[PDB]
Amino acid sequence: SLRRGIYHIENAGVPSAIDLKDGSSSDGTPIVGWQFTPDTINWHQLWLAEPIPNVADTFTLCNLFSGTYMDLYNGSSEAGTAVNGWQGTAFTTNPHQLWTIKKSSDGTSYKIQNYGSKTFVDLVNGDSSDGAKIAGWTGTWDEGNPHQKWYFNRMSVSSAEAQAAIARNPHIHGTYRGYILDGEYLVLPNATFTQIWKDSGLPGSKWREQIYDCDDFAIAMKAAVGKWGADSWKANGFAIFCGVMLGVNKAGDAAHAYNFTLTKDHADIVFFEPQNGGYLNDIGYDSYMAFY
């Protein structure tokens, strides 16, 4: 089963991702194929898959930027029916906006079937051009046709996944406690994480004993990523990943506050030093507390 989370949805045939054109909130905004840059935020190309209760393998897909939903126009079963952004809700009963998403015959990519029409999301003609039509189209669950096959490239972690990544780290103190704030987090590329650090003005902040020392940098960095999340995205029902940790050194006579993010592969954490913007596999402290 596809898990609740944020996905970059990439065609199995050509390197085109599902793109809400200009990220418009306008009803009837075309959803198209568009080229993408890896290890960035692809601003118009992120989709929040919300599972529907009591309806197997079926979801809403909410554009993270627009807060509008993938919508089969008038729910038509006609081949070539437009797939657009449209206003909706996370648990709608509008079958225009309900998508059964299951593994293709290749066992890695998925097919996206409209719950109402039973037609499939199709990159018409396998066109790799920026702005290529995406439509609802006849097809089957089993066929190889790559026009209708999509890699769901997972951009988020559950809190349980974030907890596993921390637990895998060697720099966790024996007294560690971890405090979970949210359920599902968008993992940032380091490029973006760094940019939010710059845009916060933390690079200009001077260390001052107690009045602006390591706890103040680490908590400011988390607030800045919180603020960036609300101000950047119109969808709800997720957070941005940015941890705070308190750590103790080896001698056990010095504590230090810092941040942490997650690796590309979501498997491990990386320490961030909000006083200089360094990423470290070893920040010279072992964490006895985290909140994220």
Ligand X SMILES: C[C@@H]1O[C@@H](O[C@@H]2[C@@H](O[C@H]3O[C@H](CO)[C@H](O)[C@H](O)[C@H]3O)[C@@H](O)[C@@H](CO)O[C@H]2O)[C@@H](O)[C@H](O)[C@@H]1O
Ligand Y SMILES: C[C@@H]1O[C@@H](O[C@@H]2[C@@H](O[C@H]3O[C@H](CO)[C@H](O)[C@H](O)[C@H]3O)[C@@H](O)[C@@H](CO)O[C@@H]2O)[C@@H](O)[C@H](O)[C@@H]1O
User: Of Na ion, ligand Y, ligand X, none, which one does residue 51 interact with (CB within 5 to 8 Å by kind)?
Assistant: Na ion
Nearer to Na ion among residue 55 and residue 230 (C-beta)? 55
Strand (E) or helix (H) holding 29: strand 29-34
Distance of closest approach, residue 289 Cβ to a second copy, in angstroms: 5
Residue 215 marked in a binding site: yes
CB 262 within 8 A of CB 279: no
- What are the C-alpha distances in Å from 104 to residues 31, 107, 238? 21, 5, 27
Span interacting with Ca ion, options 15-23, 70-78, 79-87, 232-240, rule CB under 5 A: 232-240
Residues between 75 and 104 with contacts to Zn ion, criterion CB under 5 A: 75
Residue 282 marked in a binding site: yes
Full DSSP string of 97-111? G-EEEEE-TTSSSEE
Nearer to Na ion among residue 23 and residue 51 (C-beta)? 51
CB 167 within 8 A of CB 33: no
CA distance 177 to 2: 31
Residues interacting with a second copy, by CB under 8 A?
Answer: 177, 179, 181-184, 205, 208-213, 215-216, 219-220, 222-224, 226-227, 229-230, 233, 235-239, 246, 257, 289, 291
Q: Applying CB under 5 A, does 216 fall inside the site for Ca ion?
A: yes
Q: Is the torsion defined by CA of 43, 52, 90, 78 positive or negative?
A: positive
Residue 10 marked in a binding site: yes
Q: Applying CB under 5 A, does 51 fall inside the site for Na ion?
A: yes
User: Of a second copy, Na ion, ligand X, none, which one does residue 14 interact with (CB within 5 to 8 Å by kind)?
Assistant: none
Nearer to ligand Y among residue 14 and residue 280 (C-beta)? 14
Strand partners for 269: 262
Residue 50 marked in a binding site: no
Structure-token match 């907890």, residue found: 163
Residue 123 marked in a binding site: no
Nearer to a second copy among residue 9 and residue 257 (C-beta)? 257
Count the neighbouring beta carbons within 10 Å of the beta carbon of residue 142: 8
Residue 149 phi, psi (nearest 5): -115, 140
Count the neighbouring beta carbons within 10 Å of the beta carbon of residue 278: 11
Residue 231 marked in a binding site: no
Residue 23 DSSP one-character state: G
- What are the C-alpha distances in Å from 140 to residues 32, 102, 112, 144? 22, 12, 11, 9
Q: Applying CB under 6 A, does 276 fall inside the site for ligand X?
A: no
Q: What angle do CA 95, 100, 102 make, to 5 degrees?
A: 175
CA distance 27 to 47: 17
Span interacting with ligand X, options 94-102, 121-129, 144-152, 168-176, rule CB under 6 A: 94-102
Q: Applying CB under 5 A, does 60 fall inside the site for Na ion?
A: no
- Which residue in 35, 153, 158, 190 binds ligand X (CB under 6 A)? 35
Distance of closest approach, residue 29 Cβ to ligand Y, in angstroms: 21
Report the interface residues with ligand X, using CB under 6 A: 19, 21-23, 27, 34-37, 40, 42-45, 71, 73-74, 86-88, 92, 94, 96-97, 130
Report the interface residues with ligand Y, using CB under 6 A: 79, 122, 124-125, 137-140, 143, 145, 147-148
